[PDB]
Amino acid sequence: PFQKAAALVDLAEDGIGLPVEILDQSSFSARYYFIFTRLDLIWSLNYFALLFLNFFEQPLWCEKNPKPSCKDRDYYYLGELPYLTNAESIIYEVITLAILLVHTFFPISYEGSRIFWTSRLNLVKVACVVILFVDVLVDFLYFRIAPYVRVIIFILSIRELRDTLVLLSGMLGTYLNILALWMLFLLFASWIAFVMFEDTQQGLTVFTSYGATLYQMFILFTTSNNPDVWIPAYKSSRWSSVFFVLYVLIGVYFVTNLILAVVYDSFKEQLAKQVSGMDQMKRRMLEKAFGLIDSDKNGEIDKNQCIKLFEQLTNYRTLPKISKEEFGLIFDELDDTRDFKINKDEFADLCQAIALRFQKEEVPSLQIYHSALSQQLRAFVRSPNFGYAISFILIINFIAVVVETTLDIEESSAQKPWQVAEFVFGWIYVLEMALKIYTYGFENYWREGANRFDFLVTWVIVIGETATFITPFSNGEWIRYLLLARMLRLIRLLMNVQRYRAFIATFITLIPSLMPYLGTIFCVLCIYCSIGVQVFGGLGNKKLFETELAEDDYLLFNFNDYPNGMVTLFNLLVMGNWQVWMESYKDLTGTWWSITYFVSFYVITILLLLNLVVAFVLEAFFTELDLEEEEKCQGQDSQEKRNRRRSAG
Amino acid sequence: PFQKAAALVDLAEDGIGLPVEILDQSSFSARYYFIFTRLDLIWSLNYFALLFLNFFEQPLWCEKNPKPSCKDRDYYYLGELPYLTNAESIIYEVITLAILLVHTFFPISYEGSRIFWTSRLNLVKVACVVILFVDVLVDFLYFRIAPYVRVIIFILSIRELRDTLVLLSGMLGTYLNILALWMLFLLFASWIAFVMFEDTQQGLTVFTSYGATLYQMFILFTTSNNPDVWIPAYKSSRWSSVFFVLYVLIGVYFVTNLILAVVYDSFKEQLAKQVSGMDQMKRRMLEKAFGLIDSDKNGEIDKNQCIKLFEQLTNYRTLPKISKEEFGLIFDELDDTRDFKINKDEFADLCQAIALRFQKEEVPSLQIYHSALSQQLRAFVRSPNFGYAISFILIINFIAVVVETTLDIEESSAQKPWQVAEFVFGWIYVLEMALKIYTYGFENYWREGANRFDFLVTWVIVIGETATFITPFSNGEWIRYLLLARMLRLIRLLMNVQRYRAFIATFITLIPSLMPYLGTIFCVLCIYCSIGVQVFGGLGNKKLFETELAEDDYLLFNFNDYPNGMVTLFNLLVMGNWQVWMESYKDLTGTWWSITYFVSFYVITILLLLNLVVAFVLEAFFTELDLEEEEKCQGQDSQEKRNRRRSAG
Ligand SMILES: COc1ccc([C@H]2N[C@H](C(=O)O)Cc3c2[nH]c2ccccc32)cc1CN1CCN(c2ccccc2F)CC1
Ligand SMILES: COc1ccc([C@H]2N[C@H](C(=O)O)Cc3c2[nH]c2ccccc32)cc1CN1CCN(c2ccccc2F)CC1
Ligand SMILES: CCCCCCCCCCCCCCCC(=O)O
Ligand SMILES: CCCCCCCCCCCCCCCC(=O)O
Ligand SMILES: [Ca+2]
Ligand SMILES: [Ca+2]
Ligand SMILES: [Ca+2]
Ligand SMILES: [Ca+2]
Ligand SMILES: [Ca+2]
Ligand SMILES: [Ca+2]
Ligand SMILES: [Ca+2]
Ligand SMILES: [Ca+2]
Ligand SMILES: [Ca+2]
Ligand SMILES: [Ca+2]
Ligand SMILES: [Ca+2]
Ligand SMILES: [Ca+2]
C-alpha cells in the first residue's frame, strides 16, 4: 500500500499538518523506516498516561522526614494526602520504569544504533533512565535525587515543554545581565536608605543595617510589605514617606517594567528563531517529497509528472477540482508556452497555497458495512438545525442548573427533582457524543479541539454515573453540577459582537497555547517543592511555630507535605503575602541562607517566567488583532513593489 | 528687527524645535500678533510657580471636618501637616486667583476677542476661574468643590497633562467594554464559587453569599488576600484549593494580562494619532513660512529666492556650509537643468533634513563687553579634559561621602572633618555651575536637560548654605548628603557597556517622558483625596477604630488628613495590603457603598492608568532598541523600492 506518487502526496500533507521527523530515507506503505514511528503513536497515548502517572508518583510519594522520629503520621507537622508505602511504592516505580524504558529505547527502531547513542537527547534521556533504575533497586533493598529525574525526565519527555525550555535558554543570558543591573539598584538603594535611617527610630528595622536593610528594601521592591515596612519611620516623620514613594515609584514603574520589556524582547526574538527553524524543518519534508517525484534530478517536475501528484493530493487530502482534457488547456492560458516545468522551490509554495485555499482535510475512512441505515442519521446530524438544537438544549440546561443550585442554597427538598433532570441532561450529551462521533468518524471528531474536550468531559460524566449508581446529593451534586462547564462553549456566542471578538478569540486561542508555558512554570514548582520537603522537615515546631507565625502560621499551615508544598508554592507564585513564608521559615532554621530559596524562586519565576507569559499573552492578542484586520482586506502584501502573476485564466 | 526672509528662517527653526501656536498671520520683529505670546514666556515661568503653589494650596489647606466639634487640632483623629487659617488662607487664595486671572485672559492679547470666547478651552478655563473666585468671596465672608477646580484648572493649565488626558479619552471607550467583560467574569465566578461553598464551612466567608462572595472573589482577583480568603475552605478540604488555583490562574495570567494588552493597543493607537496631529501642526508652520517666501503664489521658490533663505538659516540657526559663486555650480551638477524651482512640499522635507544633518543650534548672543578676559576661560572650559576633571572630582566626592556617612554609622567624631570637606565639594559644583553657565550662556546651558537639573540642585545647595549658616550635623548632614545625587550622572558611564546601553538609555529618556503620565496619575490621587477627606471625617472612632483595624489600624493611622490621605492613596496605588483600607473603612461607615470609592479607584488607576504606563515603558524601550539597531545601518528605508536621488555632486 505504498504508491510511488502516493508517498509524496501524503508527505505534502505532513508538511501542512506540520508533523516532525528527521529520517533521510525509507527503503521500500510505511517502509522500513516509517513503520517504527508509525506504530509509535498507539504507544504514544499510553506513553502519555505513563509520564503523567510516573510524574504524579512524587505527590503520592511518601515523605522523607517522617521516616525517622517522632510521632508517625500524626496531624502534628500536618499532612493531607494519601502518602504511599515503599512496598506499594516500588511495584509502581518498577512498572513506570520498565514501560518508560521500552519507550526510551523504542527510537533506535527508526534510528541508527550509533545514531541513537550519539544523539544528545537519547543519551540524556537514557541517562536519567539509568539513574532512576539504580535508585529503584537501592530503594527496593532498603532517595534524594530520585524525584528530580522524574520531573526532568518529564520535561524533555514532551516536545512542547522542551522547545519552551529552549526558548527560555536564549533569553536567559540577557536575563542574567538585566538581573545584574537590578541587583545594583537593590544594593545602592538599600545603602542610601540605611545610611538615611541609621541614627533614627527605624534603627530597629535597620538594626542589622545593610544585611537587613537590603532585605527590607528588597521586599518593598515587591510592594508586598509596603505600608508595614516603613511605618515606624513614617510615624517618626511624615516626610520619611517622601523617600519610599520616590523609591517605590522608580522600583515599580521604571525598573520592574523595563525588566519585562527585556523579557518581551528576548522572548519575541527566540520565538522568531523557533518558528523559523520550524519552517526550515517543514520545508525539509516538502523538498524531500518533491525530490522523490523528480527522478531525473534536473530540479523540475514535468506536467505529466505533476498531474498525478495533484491527482492523489486532490483525492487523498483536500477537495480542489476535477482533472480534464481542459487540464492541458489551462496550462496554455497562463503563459502560452509549452515546457510544463515547475521548480523544486516553486512546488513547495504551490503546496502551501493549496493548504490555505484548496486544502480542507477530508474524512479518513470510517468498515465492512452498508451506508443505508446510518445514512439517514448522518446528513441530519451535519445539519445546522442540529447545532441549533444542541445550543437550545444547553440553554435549557443552564436554566435547569441555575434552578437546581438555587434550590440547594434555599435548602428546599424541591432541589431533588430538577437535579435528577440534570442527570437526564447529561445523557443527552452522551448521545450527542456517540451520535456525533458516529456521524463524523473518530479522527475528524478528534480533529476539532472542542470535540476532544467534549469527549473527555462526557466520559468523566459516564464514569461518574457508573461509580455513582454502583456505589450507593453531595455524592452526586458535587460530581455533576461542575460539568455544567460543557455549556461553556456558549461563550463563543460573544465573538459575534464585534467588540468582544478579539478578547474571546484571543482567550480561546490562548487557552491551549498558554499551556506549554504554564506547564513549564509548573515543573519549576515541582523541582522547588522536592527541594522544600527535603530542606524543611520540621514545622522548635512548638515554640518556634507559634513565635514564627500567627496569622502567617495560619498561612504557615503547610510545606511539610508535598501537596501542601505545591499549594504553598502557588501562594508564593501569585505573590500574595509571600514574605511571611520567607521570614517565618527563616527563623525556623535561624539562618538567612534559607531565604535564598525564596529569593531563588522569585527571580527564576516571578521576574522571568511570569513576565514571559505576559509577553506571550500580549503577543498572541496582537496577532489576533492583525489577523482580523487582515480579513477585512488591508496592508496589501506582494513581493516588494508588485507580484508577477500575469493575469488569471 | 523683522527681516522679510528672516521671519521665515526662524519659523523653520520653530518647526524643528516644534513650538506650538496657531495664529494665521502677524501684521508688520514679533509684529502685532507674535508679541503677545512672545512676552507670555517670562509670565510663563512665574505662571508655572503660580499653578504649583496654587495647587499645593490644597494640602496646606485646613480640613473641613475639624471646623465642627469636637477636640480641636488634637492628635486624636491624627494629622501631621501645618494646616492653614482662613485669614492666612484667603490672602493666598485671592493672590493665586488674581494672578491666575491675568494669566487666563492674557490669550485674547494674541487672539480674537470672539475667538478667545468661542474657543472651548478658554471658556472652560475661564469657567473654572469664575467658580474659584465666587467661592473665594463666599469663603471670605464666612468650600465643597473649590479644590476640585484647583486640580482641574491645573490639569489643563499645562499642555503635556492635557494631551495625555486626550490620549486617555480615546482608549477610554474601549476600556469600558473590556471592563464589561471583566465584570461578567467576576459575576459568573463569584456565582459558581458561592454555589460551590454554600453548604460547606466557608459559609461564614460566604455568609452574605453573592453580595459578599462577589466581594471576596473580587479581592482574590487582585491576589491581595490570596492565602487568607480561602483558608477555611482549604482547611475543610485540600481539594478546595484546586478551585482557587484554577480561578486565580485564569484571573491573573489569562484575563488581567490581555486587559493590559487592550490598554497597550488603545494607547499605541492614540499615541500614533497624537504624534501625527502634531506633525500636521508643525507642517502648518513650515508651509506658513514657505508661503511667506513664495510671493508669486505659483507654489515654488526661485533659486535667487531660496538662496537668501539658506543664508539666514545657515547664519542664524545651524552651521551648514559657505555660499559661493560655486553655489550656482552645484545647481548645475545635480540635474544639468536651469529652472531652480523647489516646491512648497519639497522645501519642508528639505528643512527637516537640514534639521537632522546640517542642524545643530548655535548659541544665542550672550553684551556690551570684551571677549579677551573671559576668552581664556571659555576655550578651556569646553575642553574634554575639563569634563574629565569634573568626572574625577565627583568620583573623589563619592569616596569622600561614603567615608562621612560610614563615620556617622560608626558614630566616631571623625565624621565631622570629612563632612566639612563635603561642603567644600559643594562649592566646586557652584563654581562649575557659574563657570559653565558663563562659558556657554544661559540659553545653551539650559538647553541640555542635565544642565537644567544640575543648575536647580546646585541652587538647593546654595540656599541650603545661606539658611544653614545664618540659622544657627543633622542640621547639615540631612540637608547636604542627599544632594550627592548630582553625582548620579556618573551612571551614563554604563552606556559604554553594550549590554546596559538600552536599559540606562531607555531609563534616562524614560525619566522625563514618564513624567506627563505620572503627573496624570497623580492628579487623579488629588481628586480622590479631596473626595476622601470630605467623605471620611471620623476615624465610633474609639470602639470602631480598634475593632475596624489592628495591624491595619497601624495602617489605618491615616486618611483624616490631606497629606495622610495622599500617602495612604499611594499605598492603595502600589496595591500592597490595600483591602484593609477598604474593609475597615467599610465598617467605619457600615455601608457597602463606601467600598465603591475603593473599587472606583482600582478600576480607574490600577486597571487603566498603570497598565497604560506599562505600555508606555515597553514602547519607549522598544523604540530605543530600534534606534540603536538603526545606528548600525540596517532595515534600509527608501520611498518604496528605490529613491530617485540621481547621484551626488
Ligand atoms: C559583597 O559584599 C558587600 C559589598 C557592598 C555592600 C554595600 N555596603 C556598603 C556599606 O556598608 O555602606 C555600601 C555599598 C554596598 N554596595 C555598594 C555598591 C555601590 C556603592 C556603594 C555600596 C554590602 C555587601 C554585603 N552584602 C553582600 C550581599 N549579600 C547577600 C548576597 C546574596 C544572598 C544573600 C546575601 F545576604 C549580603 C551582604
Ligand atoms: C444586578 O443584580 C444581580 C444580578 C445577578 C447576580 C448574580 N446572582 C445569581 C444568583 O443569586 O445565583 C446568579 C448570577 C448572577 N449573575 C449572573 C450572570 C450570569 C449567570 C448567572 C448569574 C447578582 C446581582 C446583585 N448584585 C449586583 C451587583 N452589585 C453591586 C454592583 C456595583 C457596586 C456594588 C455592588 F454591590 C451587587 C449585587
Ligand atoms: C536622593 C534623594 C533622596 C531623599 C528623598 C527626600 C526625602 C525627605 C527626607 C526627610 C526625612 C526627615 C527625617 C527626620 C526624622 C525626625 O525628625 O526624627
Ligand atoms: C468548572 C469546574 C470548577 C471546579 C474545580 C474542581 C475543584 C475540586 C472541588 C473539590 C472540593 C471538595 C469539597 C468537599 C468539602 C468537604 O469534604 O467537607
Ligand atoms: Ca497513511
Ligand atoms: Ca522511592
Ligand atoms: Ca547605630
Ligand atoms: Ca546622624
Ligand atoms: Ca523532472
Ligand atoms: Ca491572457
Ligand atoms: Ca495556605
Ligand atoms: Ca527671535
Ligand atoms: Ca477655602
Ligand atoms: Ca445556607
Ligand atoms: Ca449541598
Ligand atoms: Ca516663487
Ligand SMILES: [Ca+2]
Ligand atoms: Ca552626474
Ligand SMILES: [Ca+2]
Ligand atoms: Ca500608613
